[PDB]
Design a protein around this ligand. Sequence first.
Ligand SMILES: Nc1ncnc2c1ncn2[C@@H]1O[C@H](COS(=O)(=O)NC(=O)CCCCCCCCCCOc2ccccc2)[C@@H](O)[C@H]1O
Ligand SMILES: [Cl-]
Ligand SMILES: [Cl-]
Length: 625
Amino acid sequence: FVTGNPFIVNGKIRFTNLVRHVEKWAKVRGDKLAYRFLDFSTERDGVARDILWSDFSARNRAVGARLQQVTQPGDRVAILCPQNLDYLISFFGALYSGRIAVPLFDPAEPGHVGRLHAVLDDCAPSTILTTTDSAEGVRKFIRARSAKERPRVIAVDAVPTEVAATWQQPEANEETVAYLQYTSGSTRIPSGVQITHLNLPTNVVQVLNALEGQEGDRGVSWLPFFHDMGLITVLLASVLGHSFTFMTPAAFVRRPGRWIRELARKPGETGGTFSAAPNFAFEHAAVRGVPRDDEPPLDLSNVKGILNGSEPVSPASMRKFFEAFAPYGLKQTAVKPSYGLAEATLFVSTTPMDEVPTVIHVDRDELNNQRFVEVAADAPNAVAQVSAGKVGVSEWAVIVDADTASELPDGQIGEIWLHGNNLGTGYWGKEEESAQTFKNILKSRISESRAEGAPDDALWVRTGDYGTYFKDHLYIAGRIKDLVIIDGRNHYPQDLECTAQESTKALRVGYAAAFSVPANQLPQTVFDDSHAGLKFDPEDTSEQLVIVGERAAGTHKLDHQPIVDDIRAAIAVGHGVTVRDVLLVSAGTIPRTSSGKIGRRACRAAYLDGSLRSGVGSPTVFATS
Ligand SMILES: Nc1ncnc2c1ncn2[C@@H]1O[C@H](COS(=O)(=O)NC(=O)CCCCCCCCCCOc2ccccc2)[C@@H](O)[C@H]1O
Ligand SMILES: [Cl-]
Ligand SMILES: [Cl-]
């Protein structure tokens, strides 16, 4: 699978069904450690829970068989389990049964129980997989829903291993849906991306090829298995030939040094380590994860690549991360900005293995007008842009003017459209939205197209992201739906947030949200302020800028103006827009998505409801102070 590659013939992927492969892999390395769960739920210093490939293989076959009895073909099997070893057994066990898996989370964890109801409504699974300790909690949750199709709850650790003897190899085609990856799609109703048996292995090869993963290397992770980056990482790490070590996201947030520690060289280890994380985590680890004087020596010279993706990369957070860990051997080539999305299984691009991150600066006015014009770092009105690198093999990413379905030249910002075998096939039960998102014809190409190699009649998937190529690197400008359009002009919310943050110490880094709202709904307090601009008018529906930013840690007083004036002035000058309401709230209050990204839509929804000014929560595993 990996050197130390027969699936890449003449620069193209070739090599299906994972169950088949997982089983061979399991028997060959039986009695070797497959997974190690570092459990920090009871002991702060942690407890190691291990499972060998043979045991893992056996458990998957037991669960698969139990499912093959209590479910019908076509049924969905949802996993409502905390992050631990039974989660993997539940997920793999579901794949082993041949039914469509739906990896989710334990209703007993905080943050998004509301999403869980929506997903269950959408895919109506006949069976829920969980652990014995979470079972009562899961049954309570399920009982509270409609009696009609009330699904069976199965505790996987209670299923005897010998049941595996009645397991029958499921038969699967390459186009068969293996599982559903739920994402908060175009509407309130979540979308379940159909990931097939061909999508998985293709994207694994795409990733391992880009990282030059070799036998002897190993993966480490704290990412949630209910998110694409966390789940796919399990599979990537599993094929490196060394055990995969993981922890829960909450354990990372509480003490990020636990992750840093697992990334370190083990005694006598010659291979390298890989991991992945969202931007905010580099900031957190840089500040909270440096080892004290007491701790045993820490060596990070073995770290090959920590992929940084899922949200815009802050050059300052990366800088602070490199600087905090450089003394321990962390190479400048070890942090790798990358791009991906659920619809592509996971991975689309990453920085080439041998190079450091590419960070450039572009003129703001040109950027907002959909063009990359490079400018010096200290140039006024400059916007930092971090490259997402080069597109994976046997995969294409083109920049398109959606209106006419035409490719755009380099430097021009358009929507990013993708084509490749790693691209999902649709959204569960959504025929029309699936057609609109996944079955698009690229009508016009520029000569020397980025579609070179794709068939003329190749189908393209619309990502919903704006982006461009610049000096052969793919840049992710931002998410189309998150744009702040005011007075007929676009603004990237992360750009406005950066400016707000940079103007005043009263805001904590990475916790700001910029969104537009019709002048109708903004509070009365805004009109009673000389620093406002507009005045009372119930007819006016024009979009107006609002900025919400968590108060820097240790904030106990309210001295709004001096901070707000700096923010409004900083944004007026550099963006040509007047911030109307600057709302600063309790540390750890701004809404976070389930993977820990800032929830802008949710911050806008709660701003209007008055649900945000007030709030001693809402608990999330990502909360800190
Ligand atoms: N670099 C970026 N900059 C700005 N925005 C980015 C972004 N990446 C994603 N996004 C934004 O997030 C959206 C997608 O969101 S999502 O559906 O929730 N999915 C996501 O966010 C998924 C992002 C995935 C990024 C690539 C990560 C590859 C990690 C491989 C590890 O390798 C290993 C590890 C261990 C052992 C061996 C190998 C995208 O549509 C875009 O708007
Ligand atoms: Cl047993
Ligand atoms: Cl080794």
